[PDB]
Amino acid sequence: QKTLHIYNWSDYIAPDTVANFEKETGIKVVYDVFDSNEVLEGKLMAGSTGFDLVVPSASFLERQLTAGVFQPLDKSKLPEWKNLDPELLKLVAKHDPDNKFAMPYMWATTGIGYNVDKVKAVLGENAPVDSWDLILKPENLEKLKSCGVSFLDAPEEVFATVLNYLGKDPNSTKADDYTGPATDLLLKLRPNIRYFHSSQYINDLANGDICVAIGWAGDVWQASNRAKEAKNGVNVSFSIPKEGAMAFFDVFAMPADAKNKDEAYQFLNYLLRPDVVAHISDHVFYANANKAATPLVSAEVRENPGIYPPADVRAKLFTLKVQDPKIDRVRTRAWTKVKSG
C-alpha cells in the first residue's frame, strides 16, 4: 500500500482533487491542513514532520531552506514543468534561486474583505472601500466595531501592511519602526478588533457575523461565493487598496526526510496538469501559477481583477523580505503585546 502525506493550507484545494488522484494512481493520501506559516515553520525546524509535501509561502521558504529543511526537486521527473508561468517563477526565484526547491502553486494578495451593505450602512455611501483607511484609520474602525472586525493572525503580513500604510518601508530593517509607530497604530486599533484569526473569518464574512476583515484574496472570494450559494442576502467583496498590498506565493516543497518521494513526485506532476489546477482555482478562487491552465479557468474567476490582477495593479504590490533575528524577535514580541490587549 503506497501512501502520501500532504500538509497544506485549509480551503486551498478542490473537494475532489485528492479523491481523483487516488483513483487514478491507487496511492492512499493522508491530507492535513494548517492556516499559519509560523505553525508550519515550527514543525519544519523541529524536524521529522512525517510529511512528504508541505506548502509554505515563498518568503518563509527562503528562511527554511537556509536551515536545510528541504531537498531539491529533481526536475527531470516533472515533464510538464514547462506549464508554469515564467514570470511567476522569477518572482519565486528571489526566495528560491534557480527554482531548485519549490513548485509555485497559488498566489494572491493580502487585502480587505468586507460586507458591502453593512459597511455602507455604517460608514455611509462613500465609505473608503478602496483604501486601507477603511480598516486602519481608528475613527472608521470604531464605527465598524459594531458589525465585527477581524485581523489575520499573521504578524509578518500585518506589520508589513501597516508599515507600508504609514509611509515606511514594508520591509523596514529598523526595529523602532515596529515597536514604535507600527505598534502604536495597532494598539490604537486593537480595541475595535473582535479577533485575530486566519481562517474562521471566511464563514463569518459569508454568514454576516463580521463586516470587515484583513484577509487573503481567495479566502474572501470563497466567502462571497458561499454567501451566493446560500442565497442569504450577504454581499461580500474584496479590495486591493490603492496604497498597495502585499503579494504572496505559496509553493509545494519536499522535506529532506520525506519517505514517499516517488508518490510525492506523482502528486506534483498531477498538479502540473492544466485541468487539475484550473479545477482547483475554480473552487478555491485563487490564481494558479500554471500558464497553460489559464484558458481552462472559469471566466468568472480568471477575469476577476481581484484574483488575476491587471499589470498596473500588480505594479503597486510588494513582497516580504527575510529579516535578521533581531527584527524577528522584536516583531514577534510586539505582536504578542498587540494581541493580548
Side-chain angles (χ1 to χ4, degrees):
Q1 176 61 304
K2 294 175 293 181
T3 337
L4 211 227
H5 288 89
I6 298 163
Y7 201 43
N8 186 209
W9 298 85
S10 63
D11 295 335
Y12 222 27
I13 208 166
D16 57 291
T17 303
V18 165
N20 291 348
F21 170 82
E22 284 186 306
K23 280 163 168 177
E24 284 200 40
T25 59
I27 292 163
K28 209 294 173 175
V29 178
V30 179
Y31 188 83
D32 288 310
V33 304
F34 59 89
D35 65 352
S36 162
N37 254 315
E38 290 85 22
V39 171
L40 200 247
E41 180 148 78
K43 303 234 178 65
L44 288 176
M45 295 302 201
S48 300
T49 52
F51 295 137
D52 301 289
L53 292 170
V54 296
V55 191
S57 290
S59 58
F60 291 70
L61 192 260
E62 191 175 350
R63 187 184 307 161
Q64 294 153 9
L65 50 73
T66 296
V69 174
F70 306 121
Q71 39 177 314
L73 289 189
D74 180 352
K75 290 192 199 163
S76 78
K77 301 187 61 185
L78 308 158
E80 316 184 81
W81 191 264
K82 291 81 169 179
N83 294 343
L84 298 166
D85 202 320
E87 298 131 66
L88 280 183
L89 281 175
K90 283 164 202 145
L91 310 195
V92 172
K94 288 177 324 172
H95 303 99
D96 179 23
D98 285 338
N99 307 285
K100 294 192 184 67
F101 292 88
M103 184 187 88
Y105 177 64
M106 301 287 145
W107 82 271
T109 59
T110 300
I112 309 180
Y114 63 94
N115 175 318
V116 179
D117 296 294
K118 277 188 190 302
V119 169
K120 241 89 285 156
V122 165
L123 290 193
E125 289 303 328
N126 48 348
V129 145
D130 64 320
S131 98
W132 282 113
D133 291 16
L134 180 76
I135 197 176
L136 293 196
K137 173 171 270 47
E139 44 267 22
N140 287 325
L141 215 63
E142 269 193 279
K143 302 162 189 301
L144 298 171
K145 175 205 281 184
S146 43
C147 49
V149 181
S150 175
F151 265 51
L152 278 180
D153 183 13
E156 321 211 8
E157 288 188 47
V158 180
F159 268 112
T161 97
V162 177
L163 276 178
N164 176 252
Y165 177 61
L166 295 174
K168 294 290 202 318
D169 186 325
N171 291 302
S172 170
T173 47
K174 301 169 178 192
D176 268 307
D177 273 329
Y178 298 76
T179 45
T183 298
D184 294 349
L185 211 200
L186 277 178
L187 285 174
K188 245 171 210 185
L189 302 172
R190 213 293 169 207
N192 307 300
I193 301 180
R194 177 174 309 158
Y195 64 68
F196 290 79
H197 205 118
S198 280
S199 69
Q200 94 178 183
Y201 73 100
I202 303 162
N203 286 344
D204 279 355
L205 263 179
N207 292 88
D209 279 332
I210 61 168
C211 58
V212 196
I214 284 192
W216 294 306
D219 283 9
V220 185
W221 290 129
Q222 296 192 29
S224 195
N225 200 244
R226 296 167 196 199
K228 267 178 310 163
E229 306 266 302
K231 254 69 196 176
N232 62 13
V234 170
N235 187 209
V236 174
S237 184
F238 171 86
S239 166
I240 294 183
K242 40 183 278 298
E243 303 103 347
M246 189 212 122
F248 53 102
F249 311 95
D250 300 347
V251 306
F252 262 76
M254 193 182 320
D257 68 333
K259 36 277 177 286
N260 317 297
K261 284 190 59 197
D262 181 60
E263 289 91 318
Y265 272 106
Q266 284 187 50
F267 193 84
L268 289 182
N269 258 297
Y270 184 82
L271 287 177
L272 281 171
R273 294 174 30 174
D275 50 310
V276 172
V277 272
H279 175 41
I280 284 156
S281 303
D282 283 333
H283 286 59
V284 131
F285 293 91
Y286 277 94
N288 54 265
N290 201 307
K291 186 168 211 173
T294 325
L296 286 172
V297 180
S298 61
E300 176 198 15
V301 167
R302 172 161 44 75
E303 297 186 326
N304 190 330
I307 293 162
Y308 277 85
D312 55 280
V313 171
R314 270 197 309 268
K316 43 184 197 188
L317 298 185
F318 57 85
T319 41
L320 279 189
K321 234 108 299 297
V322 178
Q323 300 282 16
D324 101 290
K326 192 182 180 197
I327 299 291
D328 267 357
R329 210 192 319 118
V330 168
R331 175 207 261 150
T332 315
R333 205 174 307 274
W335 187 249
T336 318
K337 184 170 57 183
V338 170
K339 270 174 72 182
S340 300

